[PDB]
Symmetry: D2
């Protein structure tokens, strides 16, 4: 396939893949993504940093051939860099190794085992283990490896301060534009917020630790393994610092499910009370919405509301999927215990709301109240929802 | 709307609604359903047994008017019977009451409160609280009520047209089917019995012990031999009542087939490869297999197959120390359904792939135990399974299948 | 239900409904919408302009009661204004009329018939047929009607507030009521989608109605545009300007590529065409019919200078999914905007083919200028993919030349 | 992967793939399918008939190895048979050829070109072009090729016909035979397969049947082993079904398809159904907002009438109808020898026109359009009675049509 490489610095090219058609990746919705791979041309050696998903190498090979042609060099890779084991960045490693068998493969110690487990043809490949720190001179260009998850590492092109961070600072976006400044800021920052919410939230304590143990001024560009390349590294570093420390807006994310609309009516009434205080509201209906967009909004919300009816003594089963996700994400690790209210309608003994409150506490939320009612809410019951929402909104505005 | 009533007995008509277009109802998938309502013409009183979902009364009114015209009676209802509070059978009660305000509403004590909570316009309506074995004479036709608490709600009851042995069982014995055909014998048996199995699995499973109790009470009173027809609130009318009674007795007592239901989720296909390998080992023993991929399948079909499976396999990869979140939904459903209530602890295996510390499979095993399953083993592997690892899955599947065949 | 009204001017409130949960409306995808209704407090009469979708009136009543309370007035509506017949704006009319039976209902002659057909309980309601340029004095506040079929605009003369119903609306559901309170990119993209899906076939009418209003001088009197969905425009020229651009066919150096596939060959061709287009610095939007839908596709076609459509051949015809998009494009009539967007038809086949020829023919019927067709046998070779790249490159050169 | 082969006859095994997880294939919905491949052990040569979809060969290799072990033979394929070029049956051909490069590949002349186009590694492979009624001996077992790029392979001694797609069904069960699953499931899947894939070939099927009957080869068929689903131990059951579908044998049934934006067309569709039902005629109702083309055409296949409704949007019918119309234009239901009856309907709010477009497209698709009914906004009680009256008349015409 004929595909053009994109020059990002003198002798440095983006030779990645545009996955236009993917809509879902590990239960994270998207409108396509990119598998960013980079080609570094040293005076003596040519290095390929990461690659792409199995079966999507056609664009990558085309761009590698195009970059080599533009540089007046032969179609050849001398050094292979594998910052991560995950198949979206290592899927083409067996074919890259088969084509250039003498090119050493730079990766972490644990990554050798993971790579061979994914691709048995790599047994006996020339792996060059990176233990904490390792450097390679390509002739006028130096690549320094920083072992960071154990399977991962960062690659720094030292002379120009270009950090190949792999997943970190990534965003799932698929555009013809390669840089951060070429797309609308809102699209970039919202995609960055979604990527942090779904993939970095449980690592928030480490993000804070690493940042303090690195203060960063030398980083001129952040080239991640997904989406846009940051020509303004401080913009994403700053965003990460805010998310990791729990800097939120006067906003509440309301999530609910319903069978006959009573819990839905309660959710809308809570929102009215919150809005009367000028606090922002994001409303999610589990029958139509999904977990990745919900957690993106929870990330900068000072409060979270969860409602569901009772069905055979348990809350409606859809809450189970979000609860399991929140249990893995650990939002309390951002250093903030977001406020929460549990609610729902019931027709007999109830119990769904009590289960919700208990699970919200386990997920790191500060549960302030619970509100369970019988069948259809009356006007007075809806006013109670409004009053509870209003009081919560007052508390949200009072939080640091 | 012009809609014809269907005569089911002398002076008895089906005046129900065909919900052709509904595809999902309280997280239960279907290809339409019916809200079965019945009109009983006595010499003195006309009784309406149940009604329909809010906003779907047009077909119902058309059929009621057609039945009244056929019987040379005035368009009038004298008795309203509300077997259940649930809006798919009570949704038209406010408009039925507004039209005929003198007609008493027969229901249970708990039902009065539930109905008024759903429809405030019913405050002050003529409710008539009824208890088991109490009766009303319509003139040559008798309606006998039987409280069916927690079948499937506490405010539930059954109405029996005693002279013809027609049991208006509301949700019990129902099936979510929407056909032009009204009777059990008019459609393929496999479609009828599979829809009946799905309805039991999703709505009657936690009530299994209560089903066995209500049955022994109905037998001791000599009422079972008197039932000539079962007219439920959804699907087909049973002209063979023993067929569905027998099916319910089997599901409530845990009568299963030499069958395994395998459910899994995957991000990179490794857990999927494991699931396929377990299936191969099970099949080598002649045991049946039903395979569900949580990325495309849903909870109602899964539990339909669990109902007559002696074993259940659940697999998912590890994501941030937890199993893939889609399992959370199925686990929460299984926690409510309580398959142990059938009198049987189905066998189970937990499995999955991981890339670091793992832990997903341990969570799965723990949750399966909480759901009443007898967890026999756990199998967690690193990334892509090797040929040897897939043979281990096949061997584990083979051993489980041997145990399945050994169970009663 | 308790719900707060939002004051938009002195004695003027938004008493609308936030439909948080709707995800699809007449085959148009969205993340909720609003049914904007307005309450105008005159010294003598209180007027309600439009209402909401059947079954969603709880928020509306709450906001009306809240606005009445804030104004120190009784819970009373004296005048009902029905700008449009469509149920998303008239659904609560039977209950508004039942509550205030003496309040006249202001609407066009054709609207009366349309409203009674929707709601039989309105037979005998006090309808007040309005002619164009007819006014009502509420006491210090004047409402002027402009018949634009059963649809009309209401102008609150004193403050220049134009209640435009669907025109200038956007399907957005936020706590924020004004255009300036949300990111411009979100507002303008939602406005582009609304124009693409609902105003495109009316482009010639948009141009004529604008040309007259400018020479007449009405446009300079508009200080605010309060539509029936989404954000209220505090900057009316921003949306008027956007409409003028869409109506005249002002496009970007961009190509929208739409395709479907059974075995991946047409998909490979589509990606190769995109590579050739990109080599010329031209923008590309890629849509796969197995996962994507018509409302987002047409939003991108609106500002694209070219459109590519590809599908394999199945029983002498193109893959059936194209039929849906073609039927939509036939009704939207993009050719009318004043420009004929460039187009290429493509696909893979395994026997006699013919799908690509059908595609080219339908693209021509939809008003596109079809430059070429490319049909190949089964899996594309490296040379065939380079041909796609070359065709996409040449098309991109032509796009930049327009 | 370890996977067991299934013995179908002495020295004949099913070595296919169970695609448990597939839910959609070329716009045809399903709950998994199978890619049936067969291993024939002769005294001298071992033949593999068809294979599987690319990337799904693990089960296939496991079943081939298991069959060879059970036969006390070495893991070896001496003959490769390729009945079709389609990747769901030829996807593993490059790896089968790489493993056994000396094994000739039997296929049609056109098949060679198609296979090499799909898999460039096959350039120079030992292809053996086969023409009609040509045979090969495996040692006590004979394989006869029947040209249909597609073809049929007949194991002559036991009368086993490897029909490839013909007589196939998209079903994925542990059970391999027709008699081991409920008849309704089998016959409904067979009806869906005919509707979506054989309908435009109806006249050719009738020709190819009369030719197989004249030769007296039909009475020789003891088993039909297709490339998808169940193996027919009762070949006449599926042959009979095919004869009925190809000749237009239908039930007193009507398929109603509609789309709506505000529910008015939906109310009309329900009212037409009420009138049809008052005549004892069967009804299948499809809402295009939730349903899809493959199930719709399955029911059209044995319906004597078809109703299509949609509102008017910018002078055109709701766009979802365009997809079904394009599908029906390819399927050519008039090829069954019957012009099914049809009514076009819809609601509108201005000038209308959607119903006229519907009627025109239904005629193009081979339907006999009897009437059109377009109304303004919400139907009144009287308008719903008119739908009911029209449905009743159509139903009377349906009952009057004979086979
Ligand atoms: C299948 C089913 C199971 C139910 N189980 C219970 C239960 O265990 N306890 C209870 O109090 N109510 C139960 N109910 C009643 C619901 O909780 C009641 O309808 C509730 O108000 C629904 O709220 P929603 O309108 O938000 O769905 C059940 C209802 C259904 C349909
Ligand atoms: C978002 C994400 C989170 C993960 N979290 C964990 C984890 O917490 N522990 C672990 O051992 N592996 C983790 N992994 C690695 C996966 O478990 C590994 O890829 C596994 O083999 C996936 O199985 P599958 O192929 O069935 O999806 C994670 C992978 C991803 C993509
Ligand atoms: C159900 C079906 C019907 C087909 N009909 C035709 C046809 O009428 N004419 C033709 O030339 N090819 C036909 N083909 C072959 C396809 O056009 C061929 O596989 C094409 O390359 C598919 O393109 P894709 O890979 O983009 O799906 C058909 C294929 C299938 C599966
Ligand atoms: C986007 C849109 C476009 C429309 N275009 C037309 C039209 O061109 N001609 C017409 O008579 N009515 C038109 N209408 C009105 C609809 O046809 C009318 O609401 C119809 O009764 C809807 O039927 P349904 O309730 O079955 O969707 C349109 C409505 C919408 C929302
Ligand atoms: Cl490999
Ligand atoms: Cl309170
Ligand atoms: Cl009420
Ligand atoms: Cl218990
Ligand atoms: Cl009304
Ligand atoms: Cl060329
Ligand atoms: Cl190949
Ligand atoms: Cl023809
Ligand atoms: Fe119920
Ligand atoms: Fe095929
Ligand atoms: Tb990644
Ligand atoms: Tb009580
Ligand atoms: Tb029910
Ligand atoms: Tb509107
Ligand atoms: Tb040729
Ligand atoms: Tb096939
Ligand atoms: Tb016109």
């Amino acid at each position: 396939m004929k595909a053009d490489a994109v020059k990002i610095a003198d002798g440095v090219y983006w030779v990645g893949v545009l996955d236009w058609d993917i809509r879902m990746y590990h239960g994270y919705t998207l409108n396509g993504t990119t598998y960013n791979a980079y080609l570094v041309f040293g005076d003596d050696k040519v290095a390929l940093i990461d690659n792409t998903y199995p079966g999507t190498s056609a664009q990558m090979w085309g761009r590698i051939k195009d970059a080599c042609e533009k540089e007046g060099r032969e179609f050849k890779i001398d050094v292979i860099v594998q910052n991560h084991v995950e198949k979206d960045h290592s899927g083409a490693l067996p074919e890259i190794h088969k084509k250039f068998p003498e090119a050493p493969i730079y990766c972490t110690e644990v990554a050798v085992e993971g790579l061979v487990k994914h691709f048995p043809s790599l047994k006996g490949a020339p792996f060059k283990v990176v233990k904490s720190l390792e450097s390679i001179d390509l002739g006028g260009k130096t690549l320094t490896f920083l072992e960071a998850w154990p399977d991962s590492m960062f690659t720094l092109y030292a002379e120009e301060g270009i950090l190949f961070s792999n997943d970190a600072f990534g965003q799932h976006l698929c555009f013809t534009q390669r840089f951060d400044h070429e797309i609308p800021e809102n699209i970039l920052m919202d995609a960055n917020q979604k990527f942090y919410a779904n993939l970095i939230t449980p690592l928030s304590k480490l993000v804070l630790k690493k940042f303090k143990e690195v203060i960063l001024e030398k980083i001129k560009m952040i080239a991640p393994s997904h989406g846009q390349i940051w020509t303004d590294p401080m913009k994403v570093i700053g965003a990460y610092q805010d998310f990791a420390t729990g800097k939120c807006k006067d906003k509440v994310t309301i999530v609910y499910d319903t069978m006959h609309g009573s819990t839905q009516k309660m959710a809308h009434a809570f929102a009215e009370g919150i809005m009367s205080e000028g606090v922002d509201v994001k409303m999610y209906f589990l029958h139509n919405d999904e977990r990745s967009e919900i957690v993106k909004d929870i990330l900068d919300s000072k409060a979270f509301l969860l409602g569901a009816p009772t069905i055979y003594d348990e809350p409606f089963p859809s809450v189970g999927d979000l609860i399991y996700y929140l249990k893995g994400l650990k939002f309390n690790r951002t250093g903030l215990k977001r406020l929460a209210l549990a609610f729902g309608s019931m027709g007999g003994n109830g119990g769904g709301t009590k289960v919700l409150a208990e699970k919200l506490k386990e997920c790191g939320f500060e549960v302030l109240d619970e509100y369970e009612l019988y069948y259809v809410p009356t006007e007075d019951e809806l006013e109670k929802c409004y009053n509870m929402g209003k009081r919560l909104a007052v508390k949200v505005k009072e939080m640091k």
